[PDB]
Design a protein around this ligand. Structure first.
Ligand SMILES: Cc1cc2nc3c(=O)[nH]c(=O)nc-3n(C[C@H](O)[C@H](O)[C@H](O)COP(=O)(O)OP(=O)(O)OC[C@H]3O[C@@H](n4cnc5c(N)ncnc54)[C@H](O)[C@@H]3O)c2cc1C
Ligand SMILES: Cc1cc2nc3c(=O)[nH]c(=O)nc-3n(C[C@H](O)[C@H](O)[C@H](O)COP(=O)(O)OP(=O)(O)OC[C@H]3O[C@@H](n4cnc5c(N)ncnc54)[C@H](O)[C@@H]3O)c2cc1C
Lengths: 395, 395
């Protein structure tokens, strides 16, 4: 009986696990799934609870509730390192030995050594961290009525106007009315400032969408500062460079959405990595190891359409999962492996709960329609992992 | 009658014991403290009596004087082994059974298998042993006037230019003028030689301090031999490797400060150890034993923030103590445990009685100032274990 160890119950790991579970049956292999928490979180929805537009329990689901415990042994613990030579994974409260290893430990923030950013800005990357953001923001608003001079309490800076930054400010902007009512704040004093170093918002995207987004978000009070890098970050706010000169923004809340890297454990375990990620072979294995598969944000894959990396996304992470599960079953039953074939469909960026932009099936989409697509597309994933029960449970 | 046994009345054990004492009331548990001597010694001060710069009684205090006998039963005896299966500790003059076990048996010298080092060099590691070093040194100086050819009587070799080695040579150097006057010795003949295998003095420290230290100590007659390992040790001195030549140093006194390891009783009792130490779980317990806590130099903890182990220090040992005491009180009361968090502040290395280097509150410090900080910092611990009575009793 071979031992399969899956590190990380995120998009990659969970999907890998649930695949193995459908593809094998009892006693074909040992399958141990390791996650730091006993829940799996819908990472792509985390911007909502961060802003408080959706309760966090809707963006997580219990792992035991998803799996067949006869088929998969679930371990709640925190990975510390990987010994490749000895095929041991060292946990915080024990060790595990594997024949096959699947690594899906996701991303960590990248602050590019920008001063203070690490210590003094928040990140949207877990359930814990979004509850902290959400409550931090509400606390600032509560403090305001008693110190109406401190408009900095009402100023929220979001670093990076990429996909995540936009989604987050959109959620913030929807929420402001309710928030201002709860705490007797004059809406006109609130400042949501999205600060991007590059010359445009959503650098890399179709300008038609960018402009539509800027228009909607500007229409709800979002200010954009473009071509504007963050020189440093403090408990009081950020310092930016405008026209080669330092200007301060006083902001009681600063959130960084400006960059991610491969979970650092991969590098520290001695794999060769680019920006913390592994450039995998065509079956998603780590170079040098015919028995180690890397999934999700830990994996780097070059796109053949251009010659640029594929970006780290849930969409591709899910696909990594399905592939590794199929290919591992093959390995186990002396079947054959199929190399990985990313089929990247389109994505939609939400703009608050009622509006959205995206390119689906080659075609641009907006507003109520775009919103529904995203929701539908996202429901596909729930269905994938928990069937109708789950799709309904998000009811 | 939950039986708590604490093995070793050093920084970890004593502080654990005095915590339990404050946190529990009568008959909540049996607390037995075991130590080989009926005194507890201030290990961090032992370099002074070793050189004779401070009487040894100032670096020890009676255990009974510190504890409440109604709360804690003190046993003077010597641990021989631990039976995990039986939950029995074998003493030299009896046995003890435990429900909970706290291990704080401190360090033993690490000689890295170097020939003779164990049998022919001294260690600064107890009150007994510093008295022996001190009286050994004085005896050599007394012998000299009657055999002026034997300048080896005036040669003292200190192995290791780490924290301890530097502190010791600094003490030796302060003391030399008095020692030469007592025994009619020509100062210019005295040789204090600090021999380090690594390529620098104080490897791991800020060079600004290193250089300042080398300057002060060189100014007082300390010679440094760096990148120079000790090939062997004999009653007549040490053999070292210079370039590739084995070169002898004739020295009537040799002291090893070059390395420590976890007390050997831990390994021989069958716990898995790295360098004699246990890699404890987040509540300081030995992996596989939910009822055994390890403290002080027996415990190994990795610095997530450099991925290298924390060094074995009194500072962290004290903190282990407090945590184990809190957590045990919890366990006794069916409560829940708080995991451990090292808060490592800064340390000062003395350089004789009137000079010192260190980093405190992020900032470097030297001379008279540095000296006072260390003295104050060290009084905090006395206060911690014996209040103002003690701080005064050392005054
Ligand atoms: C706000 C936001 C919106 C996004 N929206 C989209 C989108 O709309 N479409 C899209 O394609 N992508 C989107 N993404 C990106 C997508 O979320 C990620 O690429 C995807 O989550 C990567 O999946 P993963 O399984 O590699 O890692 P993650 O989803 O990050 O999962 C990692 C898992 O491992 C666990 N873990 C990590 N380290 C340890 C450790 N040391 N020990 C034990 N457990 C550990 C974590 O708890 C977690 O369960 C978004 C990201 C964010 C932040
Ligand atoms: C010269 C010197 C200077 C130092 N300076 C500093 C400093 O400035 N700052 C700092 O943080 N650290 C310093 N240290 C380190 C510090 O001394 C140790 O980290 C610390 O003593 C460890 O505490 P502990 O209680 O684990 O062990 P110890 O202090 O070694 O106490 C162990 C106890 O166990 C007893 N014992 C051992 N074996 C047995 C047995 N078999 N039976 C019964 N009893 C036993 C001993 O009597 C002793 O009471 C210094 C050490 C030295 C030698």
């Amino acid at each position: 009986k071979p031992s399969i160890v899956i590190l990380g119950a995120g998009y990659g790991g969970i999907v890998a696990a649930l695949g193995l579970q459908k593809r094998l049956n009892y006693n074909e292999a040992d399958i141990t799934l390791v996650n730091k928490n006993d829940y799996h979180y819908i990472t792509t929805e985390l911007h909502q609870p961060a802003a408080g537009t959706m309760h966090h329990d809707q963006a997580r689901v219990g792992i035991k509730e998803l799996i067949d415990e006869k088929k998969i042994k679930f371990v709640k613990d925190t990975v510390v390192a990987i010994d490749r030579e000895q095929q041991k994974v060292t946990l915080q409260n024990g060790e595990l030995h594997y024949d096959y290893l699947v690594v899906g430990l996701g991303s960590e923030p990248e602050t590019f050594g920008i001063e203070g950013l690490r210590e003094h800005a928040f990140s949207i990357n877990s359930i814990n961290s979004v509850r902290i953001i959400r409550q931090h923001i509400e606390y600032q608003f509560a403090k305001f009525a008693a110190e109406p001079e401190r408009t900095d309490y009402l100023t929220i800076v979001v670093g990076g106007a990429g996909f995540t930054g936009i989604e987050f400010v959109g959620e913030l902007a929807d929420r402001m009315p309710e928030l201002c009512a709860e705490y007797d704040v004059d809406p006109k004093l609130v400042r949501i400032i999205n600060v991007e170093a590059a010359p445009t918002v959503l650098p890399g995207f179709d300008p038609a969408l960018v402009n539509y987004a800027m228009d909607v978000l500007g229409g709800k009070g979002v200010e954009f500062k473009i071509g504007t890098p963050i020189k440093r970050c403090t408990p009081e706010g950020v310092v930016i460079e405008v026209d080669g000169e330092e200007e301060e923004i006083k902001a009681a809340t600063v959130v960084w959405t400006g960059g991610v890297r491969g979970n650092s454990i991969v590098e520290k375990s001695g794999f060769e990595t680019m920006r913390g990620r592994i450039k995998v072979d065509p079956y998603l294995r780590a170079p040098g190891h015919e028995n180690i598969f890397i999934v999700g944000d830990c994996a780097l894959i070059i796109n053949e359409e251009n010659n640029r990396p594929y970006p780290p996304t849930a969409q591709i992470a899910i696909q990594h999962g399905e592939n590794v599960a199929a290919n591992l079953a093959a390995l186990i039953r002396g079947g054959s492996m199929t190399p990985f074939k990313p089929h990247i469909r389109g994505t939609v960026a939400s703009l608050g709960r009622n509006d959205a932009i995206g390119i689906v099936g080659g075609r641009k989409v907006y507003g109520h329609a775009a919103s529904w697509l995203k929701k539908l597309i996202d429901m596909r994933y729930l269905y994938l992992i928990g069937g109708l029960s789950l799709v309904l449970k998000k009811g």
